[model samples]
Target: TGVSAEAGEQIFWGDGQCSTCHKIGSSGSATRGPDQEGLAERAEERAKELGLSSGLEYLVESIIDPEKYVVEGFDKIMPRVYDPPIMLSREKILAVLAYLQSLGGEPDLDAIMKFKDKIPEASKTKVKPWVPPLAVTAEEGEQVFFDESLDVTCGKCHMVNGKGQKVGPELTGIGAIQTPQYFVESILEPSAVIVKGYETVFVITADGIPYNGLIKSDTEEELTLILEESGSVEEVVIPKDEIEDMKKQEVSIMPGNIGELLSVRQFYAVIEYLRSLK
Candidate 1:
């Protein structure tokens, strides 16, 4: 059988270097490769374009031989993911694939085990962690949260206690209600788990105009959206009957890949600050 999804997640963010080039849902921020958030569905479509069948088959082929079918608009810069440094064992590959399958829906356990059986035994070894450990303290992280020099200050959009602006949600009681892991994940992949009532939606008007932003308020007959443009905030109101269509956007309004914007220590520091908020 293939390894667990958690193990595969470790490889994805830790040793696989996958995050360096690909984003899955909202966690990674690399644009070197296509975003793999909806990979299972997209893979099936891509495989059809290349005259292949089955998403699983396409996924397996892509990992072992990525250059075989370069995705349109993206350069063929990705290395064969199964090769050295990566050297993903067959089991590991299955695990990673299972995780991908899980993004849109539940993973197919039968398919995972079936694929695991096809992996060559010689390729099943654990990899060394590539990213370094966190060195900053919770106090240091608190500073990072307030300092605007590194990246967007957390207080810009989030309020802890009575401080900061109110563009995004309040974090005053976050630590009391959320786990440390939740804080780290929110920073790293904001879109993966969108906060309730803070969901971003795309609206197309009957007049052919389009707007994308978070819903500020919703009522039976109208919807109000909060849009940020060019350092300014604008509110737009639309009558429900006048709207052509609206869909909940999967991508987060909060920028993805916040981890890349800060030093590793700073990243940890921010996480610490968030955890200490309670």
Candidate 2:
């Protein structure tokens, strides 16, 4: 699995925009939604309270159909994250779940992988882009970034200032951190320059199971790797001795096929938004 917690973090802040309402640890602070500090644990308890096992299924229901159950003190204001406008793909949902699990619960890699396989082919399909080329100004691009009707949303991974997710690098003052050409190449070819800490890694277990993901934490006794599938990330913990071998790869975990996802005009509009970050 290539699940990336880093990517998931970005989705929470950017695409998923969960931070707009929910706070996780220190990154977000919005009073409209309940704090997600112990969401994984609360998800389980909420499910148990409803007379069912609180696992991925409950989490999914909570997101796709938030009104099914509401936190005691909070109003049911969360929009259907999977519905149009927010239109988070299954991948983005899993990543945000993984990010939440990382905070309190176990990141269930096997369960999430199985769920990904069960998604309908139609549901996994990306929404078709604007054919006539929508006249996207920077202001229009900002809205597009948050538009769920489109196949992809930038806030699902990129953030500006203190807003958005931590999956990819934050874009607060990104115009200064990256050149226009660098930004263009990154969008067109994600693997061209793997960010220093976001590099992909490969690990082989003594039992012959292979794993590839971004390293979340490393220690003398244990290593935590975040596996990403579709767009979700799962956490895998391996003891140092169980690893047959571990090698860091030079490829980026970001998708490289975005060139076909948006038109040249739409792409430029996104870039324009980045330039405004300064």
| CA lDDT of each prediction against the hidden true structure | 0.68, 0.68
Candidate 2, residues 1-278, lDDT tens digits: the string is: 24556667888888676776677667666554777787877777777888755556677667766778876644444656664345667777777667777667778766766667533332544445323345556676677666656666666666776665455666666543334455677788778655546778899999998989888789999988877664445689999889999887877666667787777877888876665665
Estimated TM-score for each candidate: 0.46, 0.46
After aligning candidate 1 to the native by TM-score, how far in Å is the CA of 106 from where it should be? 34
Model 1, CA-based lDDT:
0.68
Residue-wise C-alpha lDDT for candidate 1, range 205-249, written one tens digit per residue: 999999998887899999998775432356899999989999987
- Stretches of candidate 2 off by over 4 Å are 1-135, 146-150
Prediction 2 TM-score vs. true: 0.46
* Regions of candidate 1 where Cα sits further than 4 Å from its true position: 1-135, 219-222, 228-242
**Where does candidate 2 have its weakest 10-residue lDDT segment?**
124-133
